[PDB]
Amino acid sequence: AAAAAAA
Amino acid sequence: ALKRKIEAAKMPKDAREKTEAELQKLKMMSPMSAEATVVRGYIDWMLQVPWNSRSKVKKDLVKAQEVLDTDHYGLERVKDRILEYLAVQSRVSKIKGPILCLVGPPGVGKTSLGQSIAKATGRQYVRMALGGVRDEAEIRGHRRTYIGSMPGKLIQKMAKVGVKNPLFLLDQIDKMASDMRGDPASALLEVLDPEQNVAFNDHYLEVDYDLSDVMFVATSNSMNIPAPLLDRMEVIRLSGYTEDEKLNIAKQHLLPKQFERNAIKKGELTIDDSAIMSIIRYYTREAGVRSLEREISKLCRKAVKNLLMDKTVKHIEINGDNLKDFLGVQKVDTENRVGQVTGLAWTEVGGDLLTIETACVPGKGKLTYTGSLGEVMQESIQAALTVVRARADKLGINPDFYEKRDIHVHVPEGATPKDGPSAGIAMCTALVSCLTGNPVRADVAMTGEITLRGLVLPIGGLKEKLLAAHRGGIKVVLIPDDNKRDLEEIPDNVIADLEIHPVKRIDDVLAIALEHPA
Amino acid sequence: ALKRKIEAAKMPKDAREKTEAELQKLKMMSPMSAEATVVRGYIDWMLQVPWNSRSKVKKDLVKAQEVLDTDHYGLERVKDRILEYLAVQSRVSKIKGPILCLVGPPGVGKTSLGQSIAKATGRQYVRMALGGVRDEAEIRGHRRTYIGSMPGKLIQKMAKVGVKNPLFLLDQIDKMASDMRGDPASALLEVLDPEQNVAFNDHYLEVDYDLSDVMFVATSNSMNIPAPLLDRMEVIRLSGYTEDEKLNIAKQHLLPKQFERNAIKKGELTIDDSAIMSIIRYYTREAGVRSLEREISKLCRKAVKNLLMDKTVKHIEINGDNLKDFLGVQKVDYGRADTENRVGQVTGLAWTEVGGDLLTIETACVPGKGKLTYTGSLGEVMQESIQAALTVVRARADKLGINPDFYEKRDIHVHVPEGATPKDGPSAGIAMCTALVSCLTGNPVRADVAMTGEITLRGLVLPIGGLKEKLLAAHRGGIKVVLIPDDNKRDLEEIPDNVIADLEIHPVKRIDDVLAIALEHPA
Ligand SMILES: Nc1ncnc2c1ncn2[C@@H]1O[C@H](COP(=O)(O)OP(=O)(O)OP(=O)(O)O)[C@@H](O)[C@H]1O
Ligand SMILES: Nc1ncnc2c1ncn2[C@@H]1O[C@H](COP(=O)(O)OP(=O)(O)OP(=O)(O)O)[C@@H](O)[C@H]1O
Ligand SMILES: [Mg+2]
Ligand SMILES: [Mg+2]
């Protein structure tokens, strides 16, 4: 599980 | 994986290479991911956009005019235009899709006409309502970097149909909010320019898309469309209906459409001509036929309810006298008056009569204007009064009337705003009539712009003013001399019933529309 | 596998070091992982973008003018600009590439002119529409942190076209959004900067990319562009078309392509100059040619259905009398001169973006109490111009033979009879003065005289703008003698020859020259 920043 | 649906779609070279680069990129990604979900969404959009699917269009003209005559009555300029398109189409393979702009009053038949063109030319139908479209993202969409990113609403309806040649009904173009907070009218410039329809370039689908094969029929209620859009659109003006035209539309098209809408069988309900004419005159005053199918829908469902309550009777006959038994009270409905004319007014809703009243009482020269008047009409009464002051000794007025009489010009409109030069000659007729005691003959309407030397300048919207004067009981209509070239576009019953007088100057107007000679 | 693509598509120094450092970073990753997908996305985005590929720009000027004259008519200044670019490019191996802003009314052919330029120079063609575009990330993109990120659409189009010498056509550069929420017009301030295109740093591909040889041609309808953007572009003003060149565009370009779009053979339809000039005079009222080719296309499809529904008449000949049989009632009417010399009216010359038009100005001076009413949807500079003109008449009323207490005894009404049309500007001011003098003396203004110019209280005539369409409007209207200001003589250098030959043009310096020429009797 890895976080990922979306716009 | 998904190349079977890519080669199953028969895509052009740029779209095929890009979607197979995206799918080839997708296989080296780990699944259960966010960006893999983005790529599967993008491929899922490009597999359902039509790239090759084309509907076979109709070559026959007699069958076409038969179709557009079976589902509409007397929209001759538009039906001529569609026969022109289907006449050119039988000589070549493909044409740029015609970009039309149907401009007219409400209820005049512009949306169902798009359904008729769709069923007649062979194309498929979908409509995009432009009312409330406030930003370009409803036309171009967003980049797929964003979370809620879809390919606009053009490509969604292209995908919703599934063909390369549909009929977009761009409905209510004039209902778009195109200020600085968002201007979607500027995004339609690429959608409506034949220089750039072969490469549309959606924001979500950055492949160039071909909109040159799509027929664009757009509807509007006015010519208040921004000027870069007015050039890209062929404007066809649709005008209002007469009373016998509304009787033929109601008797030939609206009553059958309402009978198998409310499941009325063969011998249950009968409406004669006088009931329909009593709905036209007494329950409506519009230019369209919205309210006709409203009142006829009320008659049909009250007929079905009256057949379910009382099974003693099996047939309901409506004959213009028992409309009070169904609709109840009616809604809307002569001597020569001094200082009162009836000019003709043309709003965007249509034509209308226009009562104009003056009162010149002994005062000190004040000049008061009431009736919610625009600034151009006030300047038109000032110009009209200046025409009266210029020829005072001719007309028989005491030339001290600018300082010993004070004048009130009121239109009994009330709370409705009115503007335009077109009532101007009417003003000075009343300005003669109250200053001389000569009554204006009450069967005379008039329209025209005032020149200070005394001429009558052309006015616009002549046909709707003559239609408003035909349903108001007017018999004599004074017209500018330069609008007589429009008189061969008027229905023959209107020209037959109304007496039209083209006039060049004020002396003709006063010589015709006053009772006593001046 | 990838390093032979990096060495194959040979880069400059910083792009190669960044891309090889990126691959060396990729070598210590699992293949099916998210950071591996971000790195592979940055790598193949660095591989799709062209670093050295160009196009052989043409060198023959005569064949280039042959292509430019093949696609469009007129437009001599932009064609001069393209031939001068091809001359300097014929001498120099690599120059900066021009940044052009074409500004004009709609329909004058500035979008198709770009594809004409890209065909005539050999450069590849790229179009990007900026109409209503609000997101600045269409130009620069987003960082590769973000899911589904990518470069700006400029870098995407450069990567699509494959060369570093395209022609970008920036459509509707003035209809871009500019507020707090979105401003891509200041994002274009880096890419149209003529000195800093050598390092265009966008947000996805954070290396510097060279855009100092892309030809930028922007199309707009107005000067409503921010002043930093206007200063970075070379403005070419495409004015409206005259009658003769609309006749030549129609004969040479519009009729053959509308014959080609309708399968009309050579012996079916014929349209002469009377029908074309009748469409120009009585149906269009435009500055472009787009409604002109809509009328021509209407004639062609009506000719097609008249050849299908009849099939016993096989040649349709359209000329000046039977246009109403096809097109119908004349939509518009041009202004004409008057036939008699009349007290109080003059004919100024008005100019809008549709073109020039005659401007009738009338005055009534009835006996009253000095009331001053001004009607006709006037502006505020126009009403200040009438006040200045009335002051010039009032300070000179002893010489003119006018009873000097007319400001107490007579009421003056200046009216311009178009009414609904708003009208503003000082260029009618001389005309206003002339009308007032006529309406104070009973000396009628001769109807063959038009005039234009600004008035001052000294009496002098100041220069005005846009003489060409005003003189074309006077020549169309039947005027035989105009009155321009003195310091607009230079503009007479760019008027066509028939207009100069027909119009007796008198430059004036002060007001009694105008009152000497334009009145019937001596003042
Ligand atoms: N000439 C006609 N012949 C037959 N039916 C007509 C005609 N004109 C209008 N109608 C009927 O009127 C009904 C309503 O018209 P429609 O909704 O097309 O008005 P509209 O012009 O779209 O209004 P708006 O401009 O406000 O959108 C339609 O169902 C149509 O059947
Ligand atoms: N001098 C000319 N010679 C031939 N055709 C012309 C000429 N000027 C304009 N046209 C035609 O007018 C049409 C409209 O031009 P175009 O769309 O390229 O620019 P535009 O309409 O001025 O741009 P915009 O719509 O942004 O104002 C084109 O199809 C073009 O063929
Ligand atoms: Mg509708
Ligand atoms: Mg354009």
Encode C496-523 in three state secondary structure.
CHHHHHHCEEEEECEHHHHHHHHECCCC
Considering only CA atoms, which of C264, C280, C281 is closest in space to residue C317? C264
- The answer to whether the Cβ–Cβ distance between C34 and A2 falls below 8 Å is yes
Looking at residue B252, what DSSP letter applies? I
Q: Are residue B278 and residue B166 in the same domain, yes or no?
A: no
Note whether residue C48 is domain-resident: no
B145 touching A (Cβ < 8 Å)? yes
Residue B217 CA to residue B219 CA, distance in Å, equals 7
Residue B193 CA to residue B187 CA, distance in Å, equals 11
Classify C96 as helix, strand or coil. coil
Q: What is the CA radius of gyration of chain A?
A: 7
Looking at residue B406, what DSSP letter applies? E
Q: What is the CATH number of the domain that holds B509?
A: 3.30.230.10
Residues whose CB is less than 8 angstroms from the CB of residue B325 and which lie 6 or more positions away in sequence, other chains included: none
Range of the domain at C248: 243-325
DSSP character string of B20-35: HHHHHHHHTS-SS-SH
Beta bridge partners of C483: C506
Q: Are residue B118 and residue B231 in the same domain, yes or no?
A: yes
Q: Are residue B280 and residue B426 in the same domain, yes or no?
A: no
Query: What does the buried/exposed string (b/e) look like for C30-62 if buried means 16 or more CB atoms within 10 Å of the residue's CB?
Result: eeeebebbbbbbbbebbbbbbbeeebebbeeee
Element (H, E) at B45: helix B35-46
In 10 A of CB B423, how many CB atoms?
Answer: 28
Looking at residue C491, what DSSP letter applies? G
Residue C56 CA to residue C58 CA, distance in Å, equals 6
Beta strands in C25-154 (DSSP E): 99-103, 124-129
Q: What are phi and psi of C503, to 5 degrees?
A: -85, 130
- The answer to whether the Cβ–Cβ distance between C147 and A2 falls below 8 Å is no
A4 contacts on B by Cβ (under 8 Å): 34
Q: Are residue B345 and residue B481 in the same domain, yes or no?
A: yes
Please state the separation of Cα C32 from the chain's center in Å.
Answer: 55
Cα first-last separation, chain C: 95
Residue C441 CA to residue C520 CA, distance in Å, equals 11
Encoding tokens for residue C446?
Answer: 């001769």
In 10 A of CB C98, how many CB atoms?
Answer: 18
C30 touching A (Cβ < 8 Å)? no
Q: Is the CB of B112 under 6 A from ligand 1?
A: yes
Note whether residue B331 is domain-resident: no
Encoding tokens for residue B368?
Answer: 């008061």
Conformational region of residue B344, where left means phi above 0, alpha means psi within -120 to 50, and beta covers everything else? beta
Using CA atoms, how far residue C258 sits from B98, C262, C265, in Å, is 14, 6, 11
State the catalytic residue, choosing from C427, C480, C489, C509. Answer: C427
Query: What does the buried/exposed string (b/e) look like for B103-125 if buried means 16 or more CB atoms within 10 Å of the residue's CB?
Result: bbbebbbbbebbebbbbbbbbbe
Residues whose CB is less than 8 angstroms from the CB of residue B375 and which lie 6 or more positions away in sequence, other chains included: B419
B34 touching A (Cβ < 8 Å)? yes
Residue C106 CA to residue C240 CA, distance in Å, equals 9
Residues whose CB is less than 8 angstroms from the CB of residue B61 and which lie 6 or more positions away in sequence, other chains included: B83, B86, B87, C305, C308, C309
Beta bridge partners of C445: C342, C519
Resolution of the PDB structure in angstroms: 3.0
Q: What is the CATH number of the domain that holds C271?
A: 1.10.8.60
Q: Are residue B76 and residue B217 in the same domain, yes or no?
A: yes
Residue C428 CA to residue B9 CA, distance in Å, equals 65
**Chain A closest-CA separation from residue B35 CA (Å):** 10
For ligand 2, atom 28, the nearest C-alpha belongs to C109
Beta bridge partners of B343: B354, B446
Residue B475, Cβ density class (10 Å: 0-12 exposed, 13-18 middle, ≥19 buried): middle
Whether B422 sits among the annotated catalytic residues: the reply is yes
In 10 A of CB C478, how many CB atoms?
Answer: 17
Which ligand 1 atom minimizes the distance to the CA of B252?
4
C407 touching A (Cβ < 8 Å)? no
- Residues just before a chain gap in chain A (C–N exceeding 2.5 Å) are none
Q: What are phi and psi of B348, to 5 degrees?
A: -75, -25
Instruction: Please say whether the dihedral angle defined by the alpha carbons of residues B130, B135, B141 and B146, taken in this order, is positive or negative.
Output: negative
Whether the CB-CB separation of B483 and B502 falls below 8 Å is answered with yes
Probe residue for ligand 2, chosen from C68, C75, C111 as the CB with the greatest number of ligand atoms within 8 Å: C111
Residues in contact with ligand 2 by the CB-under-6-Å rule are: B 193, 195, 228; C 72-75, 106-112, 219, 221, 249, 253, 288-290
Please state the separation of Cα B58 from the chain's center in Å.
Answer: 28
Please state the separation of Cα B245 from the chain's center in Å.
Answer: 17
Note whether residue C321 is domain-resident: yes
Classify B48 as helix, strand or coil. coil
Residue B52, Cβ density class (10 Å: 0-12 exposed, 13-18 middle, ≥19 buried): exposed
Strands B456-457 and C504-508: unpaired
Locus of tokens 């492949």: B207
Beta bridge partners of B406: B361
Q: Residue C373: CA atoms inside 13 Å, Cβ hemisphere, count? A: 22
Whether the CB-CB separation of C414 and C363 falls below 8 Å is answered with yes
Cα first-last separation, chain A: 19
Considering only CA atoms, which of B450, B447, B475 is closest in space to residue B463? B447
Q: List helix spans (H) across B133-283.
A: 154-161, 184-191, 227-231, 243-249, 255-259, 273-282
Give the angle subtended at the CA of C460 by the CAs of C521 and C337, to the nearest 5°: 50
For ligand 1, atom 27, the nearest C-alpha belongs to B106
Considering only CA atoms, which of B207, B451, B275, B285 is closest in space to residue C416? B451
State the catalytic residue, choosing from B465, B475, B484, B504. Answer: B465
- The answer to whether the Cβ–Cβ distance between B38 and C148 falls below 8 Å is yes
Please report, as a single letter, which amino acid is at residue B286: E
Note whether residue B109 is domain-resident: yes
Please report, as a single letter, which amino acid is at residue B423: A
Element (H, E) at C413: strand C410-415
Note whether residue C11 is domain-resident: no
Residues whose CB is less than 8 angstroms from the CB of residue B284 and which lie 6 or more positions away in sequence, other chains included: B291, B292, B295, B331, B332
Instruction: Please say whether the dihedral angle defined by the alpha carbons of residues B129, B135, B139 and B141, taken in this order, is positive or negative.
Output: negative
Please report, as a single letter, which amino acid is at residue C407: Y
Using CA atoms, how far residue C27 sits from A2, C20, C41, in Å, is 20, 10, 14
Give the angle subtended at the CA of B40 by the CAs of B31 and C129, to the nearest 5°: 140
Residues whose CB is less than 8 angstroms from the CB of residue B20 and which lie 6 or more positions away in sequence, other chains included: B3, B6
Strands C372-375 and C356-367: unpaired
Q: Is the CB of B114 under 6 A from ligand 1?
A: no
Looking at residue B135, what DSSP letter applies? S
Residue C297 CA to residue B267 CA, distance in Å, equals 51
Encoding tokens for residue C218?
Answer: 């922007």
State the catalytic residue, choosing from B239, B422, B433, B463. Answer: B422
Element (H, E) at C196: none
DSSP character string of C311-355: -S---EEE-SSSSTTTT-S---------SS-BSS-EEEEEE-SS-
Note whether residue C172 is domain-resident: yes
Encoding tokens for residue C23?
Answer: 């691959």
- What is the number of CB-based contacts under 8 A between chain A and chain B? 7
- The answer to whether the Cβ–Cβ distance between C413 and B488 falls below 8 Å is no
In 10 A of CB C148, how many CB atoms?
Answer: 21
Distance from the CA of C66 to the center of ligand 2, in angstroms?
19
Residue C434 CA to residue C19 CA, distance in Å, equals 77
Which ligand 2 atom minimizes the distance to the CA of B232?
25
The four Cα atoms B502, B504, B508, B509 give a dihedral, to 10 degrees, of 70
Which ligand does the CA of B228 lie closest to?
Answer: 2
Note whether residue B448 is domain-resident: yes
Q: Are residue C290 and residue C404 in the same domain, yes or no?
A: no
Distance from the CA of B425 to the center of ligand 1, in angstroms?
35
Encoding tokens for residue B37?
Answer: 């979900």
**Which residues of chain A are at the B interface, by a Cβ-Cβ cutoff of 8 Å?**
4, 6-7
In 10 A of CB B257, how many CB atoms?
Answer: 15
Angle of the C13-26 helix axis to the C34-48 helix axis, nearest 10: 150
Query: What does the buried/exposed string (b/e) look like for B388-412 if buried means 16 or more CB atoms within 10 Å of the residue's CB?
Result: bbbbbeebebeeebbeebbbbbbbe
Using CA atoms, how far residue C422 sits from B272, B375, C350, C380, in Å, is 52, 12, 11, 11
Residues whose CB is less than 8 angstroms from the CB of residue B496 and which lie 6 or more positions away in sequence, other chains included: none
Angle of the B111-121 helix axis to the B76-88 helix axis, nearest 10: 30
Beta bridge partners of C103: C220, C237
Out of C295, C325, C355, a domain closes at: C325
Q: Is the CB of B115 under 6 A from ligand 1?
A: no
Residue B33 CA to residue B259 CA, distance in Å, equals 57
Locus of tokens 């708003």: C422
Encoding tokens for residue B388?
Answer: 């009266």
Considering only CA atoms, which of C356, C350, C347 is closest in space to residue C518? C347
Distance from the CA of C110 to the center of ligand 2, in angstroms?
6
Give, as residue ranges, everything with CB less than 5 Å from ion ligand 3.
B 111
Distance from the CA of B154 to the center of ligand 2, in angstroms?
25
Encoding tokens for residue B259?
Answer: 């009978």
Whether the CB-CB separation of B509 and B425 falls below 8 Å is answered with yes
Residue of B nearest to C415 (CA): B452
Q: Is the CB of B373 under 6 A from ligand 1?
A: no
Strands C410-415 and C356-367: antiparallel
- The answer to whether the Cβ–Cβ distance between B146 and A4 falls below 8 Å is no
**Chain A closest-CA separation from residue B135 CA (Å):** 19
DSSP character string of C138-194: GTSB--TTSTT--B-HHHHHHHHH-SS-EEEEEE-SSSS--SSS--STTTHHHHT-T
Whether the CB-CB separation of C355 and C240 falls below 8 Å is answered with yes
**Chain C closest-CA separation from residue A4 CA (Å):** 7
Residue B464 CA to residue B490 CA, distance in Å, equals 9
Q: What is the CATH number of the domain that holds B71?
A: 3.40.50.300
Q: Are residue C68 and residue C143 in the same domain, yes or no?
A: yes
Encoding tokens for residue C184?
Answer: 């891509």
Q: Residue B435: CA atoms inside 13 Å, Cβ hemisphere, count? A: 28
- The answer to whether the Cβ–Cβ distance between A7 and C34 falls below 8 Å is no
Q: Are residue B355 and residue B213 in the same domain, yes or no?
A: no
B367 contacts on C by Cβ (under 8 Å): none
Residues whose CB is less than 8 angstroms from the CB of residue B218 and which lie 6 or more positions away in sequence, other chains included: B99, B100, B101, B102, B130, B169, B170, B171, B173, B233
Residue B226 CA to residue C175 CA, distance in Å, equals 12
Element (H, E) at B404: helix B401-404
In 10 A of CB B126, how many CB atoms?
Answer: 15
Q: List helix spans (H) across C227-308.
A: 227-231, 243-249, 255-260, 273-279, 290-308
Q: Are residue C386 and residue C495 in the same domain, yes or no?
A: yes
Out of C296, C325, C354, a domain closes at: C325
Element (H, E) at B297: helix B290-309
Classify C472 as helix, strand or coil. helix
Residue B229 CA to residue C107 CA, distance in Å, equals 11
Classify B217 as helix, strand or coil. strand
Note whether residue B41 is domain-resident: no
- Nearest CB partner across the interface for C127, out of B135, B196, B449: B196
Whether the CB-CB separation of C202 and C139 falls below 8 Å is answered with yes
Considering only CA atoms, which of C470, C389, C458 is closest in space to residue C430? C389
A7 contacts on B by Cβ (under 8 Å): 145-147
Domain count of the fold of chain C: 3
Residue C259 CA to residue C257 CA, distance in Å, equals 5
Q: What are phi and psi of B210, to 5 degrees?
A: -100, 105
Probe residue for ligand 2, chosen from B189, B190, B195 as the CB with the greatest number of ligand atoms within 8 Å: B195
Encoding tokens for residue B484?
Answer: 């007589």
Considering only CA atoms, which of B407, B469, B465, B456 is closest in space to residue B432? B407
Residue of C nearest to B141 (CA): C133
B147 contacts on A by Cβ (under 8 Å): 6-7
Helix, strand and coil percent figures for chain A, each rounded to 5: 0, 0, 100
Out of C325, C354, C388, a domain closes at: C325
Q: Are residue B452 and residue B477 in the same domain, yes or no?
A: yes
Residue B448 CA to residue C417 CA, distance in Å, equals 12
| Subunits adjacent to chain A (3 or more Cβ pairs under 8 Å) | B, C
Considering only CA atoms, which of C55, C57, C124, C125 is closest in space to residue C90? C57
DSSP character string of B429-487: HHHHHHHH-PPBPTTEEE--EEPTTSBEE--S-HHHHHHHHHTTT--EEEEEGGGGGGG
**Chain A closest-CA separation from residue C145 CA (Å):** 7
Residue C348 CA to residue C416 CA, distance in Å, equals 10
DSSP character string of C110-136: SSHHHHHHHHHH--EEEEEE-TT---G
Residue B462 CA to residue B345 CA, distance in Å, equals 10
Q: Are residue B313 and residue B360 in the same domain, yes or no?
A: no
Considering only CA atoms, which of B297, B405, B313, B402 is closest in space to residue B361? B405
Q: Are residue B263 and residue B232 in the same domain, yes or no?
A: no
Instruction: Please say whether the dihedral angle defined by the alpha carbons of residues C308, C312, C313 and C314, taken in this order, is positive or negative.
Output: positive
Q: Give the sheet arrangement for strand B99-103, strand by strand.
A: B124-129, B166-171, B215-220, B99-103, B234-237
Looking at residue C190, what DSSP letter applies? H
Residues whose CB is less than 8 angstroms from the CB of residue B154 and which lie 6 or more positions away in sequence, other chains included: B128, B139, B168, B191, B200, B202, B211
Whether the CB-CB separation of C46 and C158 falls below 8 Å is answered with no
Beta bridge partners of C235: C101
Encoding tokens for residue B108?
Answer: 């005049």
Encoding tokens for residue C387?
Answer: 């006040």
B34 contacts on A by Cβ (under 8 Å): 4, 6
Residues whose CB is less than 8 angstroms from the CB of residue C224 and which lie 6 or more positions away in sequence, other chains included: C174
The experimental technique used to determine this model is cryo-EM
The four Cα atoms B471, B476, B478, B479 give a dihedral, to 10 degrees, of 60
Please state the separation of Cα B411 from the chain's center in Å.
Answer: 26
Locus of tokens 């700006």: C152
**Chain A closest-CA separation from residue B138 CA (Å):** 19
Strands C269-271 and B351-362: unpaired
**Chain A closest-CA separation from residue B34 CA (Å):** 8
- The answer to whether the Cβ–Cβ distance between B34 and A4 falls below 8 Å is yes
Give the angle subtended at the CA of C248 by the CAs of C247 and C253, to the nearest 5°: 110
Looking at residue C473, what DSSP letter applies? H
Query: What does the buried/exposed string (b/e) look like for C434-447 if buried means 16 or more CB atoms within 10 Å of the residue's CB?
Result: bbbbbbbbebbbbb
Q: Residue B479: CA atoms inside 13 Å, Cβ hemisphere, count? A: 23
Residue B277 CA to residue B257 CA, distance in Å, equals 18
Give, as residue ranges, everything with CB less than 5 Å from ion ligand 4.
C 111
